[PDB]
Design an enzyme around this catalytic site. Structure first.
Site, PDB file in Angstrom:
ATOM      1  CG  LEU A  20      -2.706 -12.354 -10.642  1.00 56.64           C
ATOM      2  CD1 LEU A  20      -2.433 -12.537  -9.163  1.00 56.64           C
ATOM      3  CD2 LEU A  20      -3.703 -13.395 -11.128  1.00 56.64           C
ATOM      4  N   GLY A  21      -3.188  -8.084 -12.210  1.00 53.01           N
ATOM      5  CA  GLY A  21      -3.648  -6.720 -12.428  1.00 53.01           C
ATOM      6  C   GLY A  21      -2.466  -5.763 -12.549  1.00 53.01           C
ATOM      7  CD  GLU A  22      -0.956  -4.517 -17.328  1.00 50.02           C
ATOM      8  OE1 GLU A  22       0.056  -5.153 -17.690  1.00 50.02           O
ATOM      9  OE2 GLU A  22      -1.565  -3.716 -18.068  1.00 50.02           O
ATOM     10  N   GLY A  23      -1.207  -1.309 -13.123  1.00 47.80           N
ATOM     11  CA  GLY A  23      -1.461  -0.011 -12.521  1.00 47.80           C
ATOM     12  C   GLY A  23      -0.785   1.117 -13.292  1.00 47.80           C
ATOM     13  N   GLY A  25       2.854   0.217  -9.867  1.00 46.23           N
ATOM     14  CA  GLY A  25       2.431  -0.914  -9.014  1.00 46.23           C
ATOM     15  C   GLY A  25       1.594  -1.922  -9.799  1.00 46.23           C
ATOM     16  CE  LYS A  49       0.034  -3.241  -4.886  1.00 42.79           C
ATOM     17  NZ  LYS A  49      -1.218  -2.946  -4.180  1.00 42.79           N
ATOM     18  CD  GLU A  97      -3.433 -15.642   3.061  1.00 42.70           C
ATOM     19  OE1 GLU A  97      -4.245 -14.720   3.299  1.00 42.70           O
ATOM     20  OE2 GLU A  97      -3.408 -16.720   3.695  1.00 42.70           O
ATOM     21  CB  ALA A  99      -7.894 -14.502  -3.826  1.00 40.76           C
ATOM     22  CG  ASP A 146     -12.128   2.257  -2.605  1.00 41.96           C
ATOM     23  OD1 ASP A 146     -13.297   2.689  -2.711  1.00 41.96           O
ATOM     24  OD2 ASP A 146     -11.524   1.649  -3.517  1.00 41.96           O
ATOM     25  NE  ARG A 150     -13.292   0.053  -6.213  1.00 43.60           N
ATOM     26  CZ  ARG A 150     -14.440   0.621  -5.849  1.00 43.60           C
ATOM     27  NH1 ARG A 150     -15.593   0.099  -6.231  1.00 43.60           N
ATOM     28  NH2 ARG A 150     -14.436   1.733  -5.132  1.00 43.60           N
ATOM     29  CG  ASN A 151     -10.508  -2.617  -3.178  1.00 45.94           C
ATOM     30  OD1 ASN A 151      -9.579  -2.889  -3.947  1.00 45.94           O
ATOM     31  ND2 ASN A 151     -11.093  -1.429  -3.152  1.00 45.94           N
ATOM     32  CG  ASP A 164      -5.542  -2.864  -2.899  1.00 44.60           C
ATOM     33  OD1 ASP A 164      -4.541  -3.613  -2.845  1.00 44.60           O
ATOM     34  OD2 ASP A 164      -6.066  -2.480  -3.968  1.00 44.60           O
TER      35      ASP A 164
HETATM   36  C1  LIG Z   1      -4.792  -5.346  -8.212  1.00 49.58           C
HETATM   37  C2  LIG Z   1      -5.131  -6.786  -7.889  1.00 49.58           C
HETATM   38  O1  LIG Z   1      -4.510  -7.040  -6.604  1.00 49.58           O
HETATM   39  C3  LIG Z   1      -4.450  -8.320  -6.106  1.00 49.58           C
HETATM   40  C4  LIG Z   1      -3.789  -8.455  -4.873  1.00 49.58           C
HETATM   41  C5  LIG Z   1      -3.657  -9.681  -4.257  1.00 49.58           C
HETATM   42  C6  LIG Z   1      -4.209 -10.797  -4.894  1.00 49.58           C
HETATM   43  N1  LIG Z   1      -4.256 -12.120  -4.555  1.00 49.58           N
HETATM   44  N2  LIG Z   1      -4.913 -12.845  -5.494  1.00 49.58           N
HETATM   45  C7  LIG Z   1      -5.300 -12.014  -6.458  1.00 49.58           C
HETATM   46  C8  LIG Z   1      -6.049 -12.536  -7.618  1.00 49.58           C
HETATM   47  C9  LIG Z   1      -5.930 -13.858  -8.031  1.00 49.58           C
HETATM   48  C10 LIG Z   1      -6.645 -14.318  -9.121  1.00 49.58           C
HETATM   49  C11 LIG Z   1      -7.479 -13.437  -9.799  1.00 49.58           C
HETATM   50  N3  LIG Z   1      -8.246 -13.848 -10.914  1.00 49.58           N
HETATM   51  C12 LIG Z   1      -8.140 -15.038 -11.776  1.00 49.58           C
HETATM   52  C13 LIG Z   1      -9.650 -14.838 -12.115  1.00 49.58           C
HETATM   53  C14 LIG Z   1      -9.670 -13.589 -11.193  1.00 49.58           C
HETATM   54  C15 LIG Z   1     -10.146 -14.705 -13.573  1.00 49.58           C
HETATM   55  N4  LIG Z   1     -11.073 -15.851 -13.313  1.00 49.58           N
HETATM   56  S1  LIG Z   1     -11.165 -17.102 -14.355  1.00 49.58           S
HETATM   57  C16 LIG Z   1      -9.549 -17.744 -14.615  1.00 49.58           C
HETATM   58  O2  LIG Z   1     -11.927 -18.143 -13.729  1.00 49.58           O
HETATM   59  O3  LIG Z   1     -11.619 -16.561 -15.601  1.00 49.58           O
HETATM   60  C17 LIG Z   1     -10.635 -16.012 -11.891  1.00 49.58           C
HETATM   61  N5  LIG Z   1      -7.615 -12.161  -9.409  1.00 49.58           N
HETATM   62  C18 LIG Z   1      -6.909 -11.721  -8.344  1.00 49.58           C
HETATM   63  C19 LIG Z   1      -4.881 -10.687  -6.124  1.00 49.58           C
HETATM   64  C20 LIG Z   1      -5.000  -9.433  -6.738  1.00 49.58           C
HETATM   65  C21 LIG Z   1      -6.627  -7.004  -7.898  1.00 49.58           C
HETATM   66  C22 LIG Z   1      -7.273  -7.671  -8.941  1.00 49.58           C
HETATM   67 CL1  LIG Z   1      -6.396  -8.292 -10.309  1.00 49.58          CL
HETATM   68  C23 LIG Z   1      -8.639  -7.858  -8.903  1.00 49.58           C
HETATM   69  N6  LIG Z   1      -9.397  -7.419  -7.900  1.00 49.58           N
HETATM   70  C24 LIG Z   1      -8.799  -6.781  -6.896  1.00 49.58           C
HETATM   71  C25 LIG Z   1      -7.438  -6.555  -6.856  1.00 49.58           C
HETATM   72 CL2  LIG Z   1      -6.772  -5.714  -5.487  1.00 49.58          CL
END
Ligand SMILES: C[C@@H](Oc1ccc2[nH]nc(-c3ccc(N4CC5(C4)CN(S(C)(=O)=O)C5)nc3)c2c1)c1c(Cl)cncc1Cl
Length: 281
Positions: A20-23, A25, A49, A97, A99, A146, A150-151, A164
């Protein structure tokens, strides 16, 4: 690591998916089989994570501390809750969870009109939930440091969840090139003082972010110039498509004197009233 049976999940009950995301972590989409023992044949989409290849020993410490912090803080609808962890016989996985609709900045930008549709109520509703989430954290003596769009993450059911919360180079930019200093309160930015009141300032920017449908604060403004504006007592313009009442709220949040800013408790009460009076058309 010591086991904590309350939260422990066997590794064979966790099917890892795409990142989902890198760093460097990192975070990964996964599926948990029987996340709670009462419902053992259920699959739940989760976010895991974990550390990356060249993580330090102190990086591990940080991840652990994040996990323990979450246990302390407890459950709330409008935060990203801890679901479980794998701490035994393998790398540390911290299961939170999922999202589905990403962070709030992405969510808002994806629902801008052409040039699916969020009503005025939806926008205000978004701010309410975020405020409700911050009030809970604040009640648990948790300072985010923060708070930004974005968070904030958004679930399949459009629930705002703060991320976060359980975790400096000013010139460092985010993943898509924004400077976090633009969310910082003056006393935090200058005097390095962080309070709940400093989170209220940041919530002020988050409001602005919402009613600009993921607008970027102070576009084209470097850090030195940001210091200039704040010292001059400059405040961002009222967004188009935003009431005076809501602009006043932001301005209140951006009150120079921290003690004169509203509490999240107050912001929850005000947004409660406003949501009910904001139309959905
Ligand atoms: C570092 C990562 O940390 C987390 C920590 C718990 C989570 N729970 N769920 C997520 C999550 C789940 C899905 C998700 N994405 C799939 C999409 C965004 C891309 N679209 S799409 C598939 O419709 O093109 C929806 N991004 C984050 C998540 C991310 C993060 C990201 Cl990738 C984006 N913004 C904030 C943060 Cl903190």
């Amino acid at each position: 690591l010591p086991e904590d049976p309350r939260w422990e999940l066997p590794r064979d009950r966790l099917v890892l998916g795409k990142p989902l995301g890198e760093g460097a972590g990192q975070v990964v989409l996964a599926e948990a089989i029987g996340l709670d023992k009462d419902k053992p044949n259920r699959v739940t989409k989760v976010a895991v994570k974990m550390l990356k290849s060249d993580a330090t020993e102190k990086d591990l410490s940080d991840l652990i501390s994040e996990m323990e912090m979450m246990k302390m803080i407890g459950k709330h609808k409008n935060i990203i809750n801890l679901l479980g962890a794998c701490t035994q016989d393998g790398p540390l996985y911290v299961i939170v969870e999922y999202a589905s609709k990403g962070n709030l900045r992405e969510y808002l930008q994806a629902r801008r009109p052409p040039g699916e549709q969020l009503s005025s109520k939806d926008l205000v509703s978004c701010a309410y939930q975020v405020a409700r989430g911050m009030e809970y954290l604040a009640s648990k003596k948790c300072i985010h440091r923060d708070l930004a769009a974005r968070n904030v993450l958004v679930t399949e059911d459009n629930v705002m969840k703060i991320a976060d919360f359980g975790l400096i180079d000013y010139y460092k930019k985010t993943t898509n090139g924004r400077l976090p200093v633009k969310w910082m309160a003056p006393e935090a930015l200058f005097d390095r003082i962080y309070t709940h009141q400093s989170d209220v300032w940041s919530f002020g920017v988050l409001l602005w972010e919402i009613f600009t449908l993921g607008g970027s604060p102070y576009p084209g403004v470097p850090v030195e110039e940001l210091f200039k504006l704040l010292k001059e007592g400059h405040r961002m313009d009222k967004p188009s498509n935003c009431t005076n009442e809501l602009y006043m709220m932001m301005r209140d949040c951006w009150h120079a004197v921290p003690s004169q800013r509203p509490t999240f408790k107050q912001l929850v009460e005000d947004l409660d009233r406003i949501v009910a009076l904001t139309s959905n058309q």
